[PDB]
């Protein structure tokens, strides 16, 4: 409907796949080559389904900060026959607050879903499902089950992936350029 939705759509149409684990179906953001991200609660194993095709996992790393605190991002390298468009130049270099973000989801349950979430706070610490988690972004939108792995964008930047909510607020794990060197 506007330039924010334009940027979000451009990312969704080229840089997402539907990932299925034993814990559910998730929006999955491809970043470059065969490297993608997913929330760590997806519990990626040795095999994952990508757009309903059985795919070997070549590597999976659940990221933690240098305080040894959960970040809720898993970086996955996929044994896929096709590379993602390289979008690492859209990743922020530092922790930050944002205006006028969009959360975009594409699954069987919610195809072609876009949500204008407004202001995004650098929230920092969150007890996420009982797990201390750092680098959390917050937005004041009542997100629901099915939106985990959703991509959070502003015009020009891919800033996070949705990892939870409390009924009134939604929470995303930051994406930083330094995770994908």
Curated annotation (Swiss-Prot):
Superkingdom field: Viruses
Subunit and interaction comment: Interacts with host IFIH1/MDA5; this interaction inhibits host IFIH1.
Subcellular location: Host cytoplasm
Protein name as catalogued: Protease 3C
Native species: Human enterovirus D68
Domain Peptidase C3: residue ranges: 2-180
Catalytic activity: Selective cleavage of Gln-|-Gly bond in the poliovirus polyprotein. In other picornavirus reactions Glu may be substituted for Gln, and Ser or Thr for Gly
Function statement: Major viral protease that mediates proteolytic processing of the polyprotein. Cleaves host EIF5B, contributing to host translation shutoff. Also cleaves host PABPC1, contributing to host translation shutoff. Binds and inhibits host IFIH1/MDA5, thereby inhibiting the type-I IFN production and the establishment of the antiviral state. Cleaves host MAP3K7/TAK1, resulting in inhibition of TRAF6-triggered NF-kappa-B induction. Cleaves host TICAM1; this interaction allows the virus to disrupt host TLR3 signaling. Cleaves host IRF7, resulting in inhibition of type-I IFN production.
Active-site residues per Swiss-Prot or TrEMBL entry: 41 (for protease 3c activity), 72 (for protease 3c activity), 148 (for protease 3c activity)
Residues of the full protein shown: 1549 to 1728 of 2188
